[PDB]
């Protein structure tokens, strides 16, 4: 992101703040994987949003004096020749003001000696309480020094307000620079999904297909997935977060792959389901066709002024009609709709926000997701049907899990589909898989 | 591992324990990556060593009545249809006695209502204090219930003893079944390194070579690396834990790759350094030959009765002589050795234990690693030289980072090299890369 993008975001947050206030935003702690080995570092999304700085042990403070004056202070790791030979290069205090466009930079290891002085006699501090223990302890120890420091003329701000609601509502609306990154994440994720369809063969293991996907992400500079990849063959595709990926892929089964890269801090999220052996059986194609009808209806409908709730009603109708046709449900369509009889087979939401997190921040309005869509929102569109191996249905449909998922951007006139470059028509899938 | 292997390990720990005691071994917590997404779960090594069970929220209790009577209890997650449709299959309580060879299994969420009853009237509890907050919490709440329950005729064990010294000394000596796993980890890791040499070209990014290696691991059923891969081209090879892997590989630089798979819970750990363009420059070759003479000599020397300390002494002499002969150091050999003049260029250990962790558990004896070696010990052999870009040395050597690392098992008379199947001779490297 450009300097101006990050400064715009900081200034937008500052605009919400009161005079005589400071917002404090913390980096993610490091995560142990085992003993002294750590997982590859993933910076806190909100901290990244404001800085693009991917070091741990860093804290940004935005201090608002009045409506025309504010300044910033960063705490971050010191330059140190020895830790740097060992553990890698660090930004340090000297370079940080110009690199990160902050006014002052201080060593993180002095944070407890310095932060309280920064917050002294402010009115409000903005902090994300409960997010990280280490951050809470720092902020709370600072406030207690101030409460106990009357003799030193110290005073604690009396109010602590969460900045998450404000910053998350910002993150809900993507800028052009963010859309461009999400476009590329979607294209990388699509290329990976095409590759999996091209490489899949009976006898391969689910984890071998995951390996194809992850290798594709890495070629294009997305080293890490945005979430643990699901490669669910046969009955495994009926488990929504199946990530064991430990089974042989069987001739005659479908495989459901839900995979998306993290590309410069933004997520793709694609699901495609396809026959392991390259030919849908009749029962597979029939369930597939309902899911495809659902996604295509959804893609036609998503636009400014509708909502996830409203498009979901149209999907449910399609599902109920189709399930009655297959004998999976029985009875009157409207009654079955009122009874939400699709729920044993479609048990999750149609769409979630997408962004720096795969389940992105932002207010859906309520648990039914009636928020009115507007340009710049980015969301998934992910209908599915999962018919358990022991479902009380005609036996030919048992053990079929299908989901089809694309990522879209709401535009002025409708939506842009960022992931349509990997096929979803079942004949197209079969043709693609026949080339190989 | 076979059921018998886990039994052998459990009985070996029980053999150390006092009559009237229980050992408590906890699973790892899950690790957040971002917001509601988690990193791929990594079981705690010691818990895995005793169980092979890869679920969080699991606790093993080994209770010793006397020298001929013991029993076990597992706490683990319950079977739950809905959480399992969403999040994956769980073992549950009914299946656990057979699957994990425990006498009894109880729900994890009842642990605080159950554990104190298991520890009542024992004399000693074995617990790894400080390892995990959640575990300390559970154990110490159980103890407090017992201390405060004299009205219910409860009694707390008066002694808490760490089992880590014992269990880590067990892990230091590998069984046949473990060596056979480490062999395959070494082989998979070597195949990946060979592939990196075959694929490397100028203009490829460091992360792209990493992608090659990780794909190879996954092909063979090692989904995850044992640690974050280092691909350090040019000056990046001089940073020991360089994992940014973000630079173009340049014509005329070496690249240092340190990578190893995690295969069925055990780590490989190989380092190879090679020219990006397939031909060592004279200075690259001269430095490389010092490191190669160091690893070759170490491989001849490691055997029962010596120590990492003692072999390291020989390595240092090789290095100092080598560096003096090139003009990189200046002075008398023994003087320089006594002055530890090699340290700016070789600043880490020659060897670390290897097992379920890359930096495996086990007592080194002293900071200089004088532990006398015995059959069954598994260790790396990893000399290196790292000539800083601003080093005060003849300038053709600046910016060269070379490490060569194999994994060995100490045997009755010497050692077996698990990773010699990837080349290290510099002419074998050039020939291999020329074929490509
Ligand atoms: Mg999704
Ligand atoms: Mg998805
Ligand atoms: Mg290594
Ligand atoms: Mg090593």
XYZ file of N, CA, C and O and ligand atoms in Angstrom, chain B residues 227 258 269-271 352 354 358-359 380-382 403 405 407, ligand 4:
61
model
N 10.438 -26.928 10.702
C 10.824 -25.563 11.066
C 10.755 -24.691 9.813
O 10.643 -25.237 8.700
N 18.371 -24.293 4.342
C 18.256 -25.121 5.518
C 16.788 -25.508 5.638
O 15.909 -24.611 5.788
N 16.621 -32.376 9.182
C 17.228 -31.066 9.215
C 18.480 -31.083 8.404
O 19.502 -31.624 8.854
N 18.381 -30.606 7.170
C 19.523 -30.624 6.238
C 19.831 -29.187 5.879
O 18.922 -28.385 5.644
N 21.137 -28.899 5.738
C 21.548 -27.657 5.090
C 22.445 -28.036 3.941
O 23.360 -28.865 4.058
N 23.284 -30.245 17.301
C 22.198 -30.339 18.316
C 21.478 -31.688 18.171
O 21.459 -32.308 17.132
N 18.457 -34.231 17.702
C 17.394 -34.247 16.696
C 16.375 -35.333 17.052
O 16.737 -36.412 17.523
N 13.148 -30.328 16.183
C 14.398 -30.049 15.514
C 15.538 -29.709 16.428
O 16.635 -30.334 16.279
N 15.329 -28.872 17.447
C 16.299 -28.701 18.470
C 15.866 -29.645 19.597
O 15.061 -29.255 20.463
N 22.557 -33.481 14.714
C 22.961 -32.842 13.488
C 24.485 -32.660 13.490
O 25.161 -32.592 14.546
N 25.029 -32.457 12.312
C 26.425 -32.077 12.163
C 26.455 -30.934 11.139
O 26.114 -31.154 9.974
N 26.734 -29.723 11.600
C 26.425 -28.522 10.869
C 27.450 -27.402 10.975
O 27.153 -26.276 11.272
N 26.837 -23.242 4.997
C 26.686 -24.235 6.002
C 26.390 -25.546 5.269
O 25.696 -25.577 4.246
N 25.063 -29.461 6.447
C 24.486 -30.126 7.635
C 23.840 -31.426 7.275
O 22.954 -31.461 6.356
N 22.272 -35.221 9.241
C 21.657 -35.798 10.472
C 22.241 -37.211 10.622
O 22.224 -38.021 9.637
Mg 20.321 -28.069 12.665
